[PDB]
From Swiss-Prot, chain A:
Belongs to the fungal fatty acid synthetase subunit beta family. Fatty acid synthetase catalyzes the formation of long-chain fatty acids from acetyl-CoA, malonyl-CoA and NADPH. The beta subunit contains domains for: [acyl-carrier-protein] acetyltransferase and malonyltransferase, S-acyl fatty acid synthase thioesterase, enoyl-[acyl-carrier-protein] reductase, and 3-hydroxypalmitoyl-[acyl-carrier-protein] dehydratase. It comes from the Eukaryota. [Alpha(6)beta(6)] hexamers of two multifunctional subunits (alpha and beta). Present with 91800 molecules/cell in log phase SD medium. This is Fatty acid synthase subunit beta. The chain holds residues 1487 to 1556 of 2051 of the full protein.
Curated annotation (Swiss-Prot), chain B:
[Alpha(6)beta(6)] hexamers of two multifunctional subunits (alpha and beta). Fatty acid synthetase catalyzes the formation of long-chain fatty acids from acetyl-CoA, malonyl-CoA and NADPH. The alpha subunit contains domains for: acyl carrier protein, 3-oxoacyl-[acyl-carrier-protein] reductase, and 3-oxoacyl-[acyl-carrier-protein] synthase. This subunit coordinates the binding of the six beta subunits to the enzyme complex. Belongs to the thiolase-like superfamily. Fungal fatty acid synthetase subunit alpha family. Coiled coil: none annotated. It comes from Saccharomyces cerevisiae (strain ATCC 204508 / S288c). The lineage of its organism: Eukaryota, Fungi, Dikarya, Ascomycota, Saccharomycotina. The modification Phosphoserine is found at residue 38. Present with 17000 molecules/cell in log phase SD medium. 4'-phosphopantetheine is transferred from CoA to a specific serine of the Acyl carrier domain by the C-terminal PPT domain. This modification is essential for activity because fatty acids are bound in thioester linkage to the sulfhydryl of the prosthetic group. The chain holds residues 921 to 968 of 1887 of the full protein. This is Fatty acid synthase subunit alpha.
Length: 70, 48
């Protein structure tokens, strides 16, 4: 993968690569090292509390041919 | 009255405090770098 550096403008620009290759092994040391030393950036950010939208009722059709043929 | 100097020539080094600090910093950084690299190599070997 590409290793990038964060610029003062909060812009990530490639400055290197990760290039690990190995034969028989019990795991990936790169991911272990990154988990232990760095922090995982999660794109999804949960809210303080979930917001219910609605509880809805749907019905499965009596036959599956209409969906199968389309 | 006599002034014996048993200083071992320590007075002739310039900036002895800063020199001593740099010696300690060099030895400390070498020790920590070696320790960290050894630990990480051990962890990588164990994972592999």
């Amino acid at each position: 993968g590409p290793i990038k550096v964060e610029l003062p403008t909060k812009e990530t620009v490639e400055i290197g690569i990760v290039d690990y290759e190995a034969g028989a092994s019990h795991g990936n040391p790169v991911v272990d090292f990154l988990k232990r030393n760095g922090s995982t950036l999660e794109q999804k950010v949960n809210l303080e509390n979930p917001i219910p939208i609605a509880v809805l009722d749907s019905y499965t059709p009596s036959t599956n041919e209409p969906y199968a043929r389309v | 009255p006599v002034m014996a100097d048993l200083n071992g020539g320590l007075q002739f080094v310039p900036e002895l405090k800063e020199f001593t600090a740099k010696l300690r910093k060099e030895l400390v950084e070498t020790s920590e770098v070696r320790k960290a690299v050894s630990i990480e190599t051990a962890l990588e070997h164990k994972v592999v």
